[PDB]
């Protein structure tokens, strides 16, 4: 899953879609807005980071940490040993958060929702394979 | 009256308010909506051309025929010999149709009011329009 050719395609489209500076913040807020719109039960899981107001600094900061982690993982997609160690670190952090498989399936569909709306070209096949590569490393 | 200068002013302002294409329907709708509101019995005179629904295609064709006839006369205001012949023919199309004599002053009032609303009320020469419109309808009515 997620071969060396697909990694380059996903790295290129992510960097362009994720953008820079405040665009990353609006992108990250849009991602969790789509997550909540897809799975309403996932919103309560973030009650500890100011999810009551999604424009607050506290919740915007959480969204950037998650997309920033997605950013650092995609950045290391072509270094298999490095990303495996990083995903294992993330898997350890998420193990106590009472998450299930549908939580990560909803996050994936949220990614498949927001990423292409900031692009002119999007290969959902490569993104499906490479997101699955990342999510399975975290989910367990 | 309707002096030679009045006829130039009426011709210019008529062409402006009458206009081209569908703008002629905008002027016509102002005339028939005003006429029928001030004289509700006039609508019955147009039962053959669907006067109950002035927005129908049938009545719009009639409306543009009438405005075309008025445009015809307005354009010939400065050509009195031809105007008289145009008015004589228009009289033949209206005589014994049962048209009340009060309908022509009322139509004049509606036509002038619609032109005034389209070109603007400021400096509008009601005397030129009334006198020149009266020369036209007096050749048609009766």
């Amino acid at each position: 899953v997620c071969n060396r050719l697909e990694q380059i395609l996903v790295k290129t489209q992510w960097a362009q879609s994720y953008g820079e500076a405040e665009n990353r913040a609006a992108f990250s807020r849009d991602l969790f807005s789509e997550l909540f719109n897809i799975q309403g039960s996932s919103r309560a899981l973030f009650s500890g980071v100011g999810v009551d107001d999604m424009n607050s600094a506290a919740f915007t900061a959480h969204c950037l940490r998650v997309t920033g982690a997605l950013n650092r993982l995609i950045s290391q997609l072509d270094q298999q040993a490095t990303i495996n160690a990083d995903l294992a670190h993330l898997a350890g952090q998420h193990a106590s958060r009472n998450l299930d498989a549908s939580n990560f399936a909803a996050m994936g569909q949220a990614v498949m929702s927001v990423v292409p709306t900031h692009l002119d070209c999007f290969n959902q096949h490569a993104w499906g394979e490479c997101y699955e590569r990342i999510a399975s490393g975290i989910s367990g | 009256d309707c002096t030679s200068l009045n006829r130039l002013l009426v011709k210019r302002q008529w062409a402006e308010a009458y206009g081209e294409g569908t703008n002629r329907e905008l002027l016509g709708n102002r005339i028939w909506e005003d006429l029928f509101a001030n004289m509700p019995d006039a609508r019955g005179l147009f039962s053959r051309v669907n006067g109950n629904d002035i927005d129908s295609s049938e009545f719009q064709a009639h409306s543009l025929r009438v405005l075309g006839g008025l445009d015809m006369c307005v354009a010939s205001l400065d050509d009195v010999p031809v105007l008289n012949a145009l008015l004589a023919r228009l009289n033949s199309q209206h005589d014994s149709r049962g048209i009340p004599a009060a309908g022509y002053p009322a139509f004049v009032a509606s036509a002038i009011s619609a032109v005034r609303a389209t070109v603007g009320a400021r400096s509008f020469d009601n005397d030129a329009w009334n006198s020149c419109m009266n020369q036209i309808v007096s050749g048609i009515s009766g």
Partner: protein, 146 residues
């Protein structure tokens, strides 16, 4: 042939630029030349207009008939942006010409030639192609039935 959206926009603008009531001593000149041309191409057509003094062209009676007929085209030309109303008007004009003995559909082909001869001489910027197709769309609606 089809009178397209671009055709009727061109024809309506150039016609109204010549026929507008804002000008003087144009309608009679244009309308007289049209009928002068019609009689020059169809000497038999003049007999159909004996009630309007066709043998005295400069009479107010014949001048008024020319203006009256050609203004009917102005009414129809300015309906080209509302063909639903145009179809009602062309049906109205057809019934009036069916009640006139001797008026045949081939006469409108001669009337088209008369306009096709007069308009290029009078209208700055004239598109004969657009004129021929949009006149046909109006004339074919009238001449149906006869």
């Amino acid at each position: 042939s089809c009178c397209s959206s671009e055709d009727r926009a061109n024809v309506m603008h150039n016609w109204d630029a010549a026929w507008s009531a804002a000008y003087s001593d144009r309608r009679v000149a244009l309308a007289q030349a049209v009928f002068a041309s019609l009689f020059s191409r169809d000497a038999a057509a003049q007999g159909l207009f004996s009630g309007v003094s066709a043998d005295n062209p400069d009479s107010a009676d014949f001048r008024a008939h020319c203006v009256r007929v050609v203004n009917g085209l102005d009414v129809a030309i300015n309906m080209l942006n509302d063909p639903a109303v145009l179809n009602e008007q062309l049906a109205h004009l057809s019934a009036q010409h069916q009640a006139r003995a001797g008026v045949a559909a081939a006469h409108f082909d001669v009337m088209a030639e008369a306009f096709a001869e007069v308009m290029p001489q009078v209208s700055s910027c004239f598109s004969s192609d657009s004129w021929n197709r949009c006149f046909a769309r109006i004339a074919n609606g009238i001449s149906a039935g006869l």
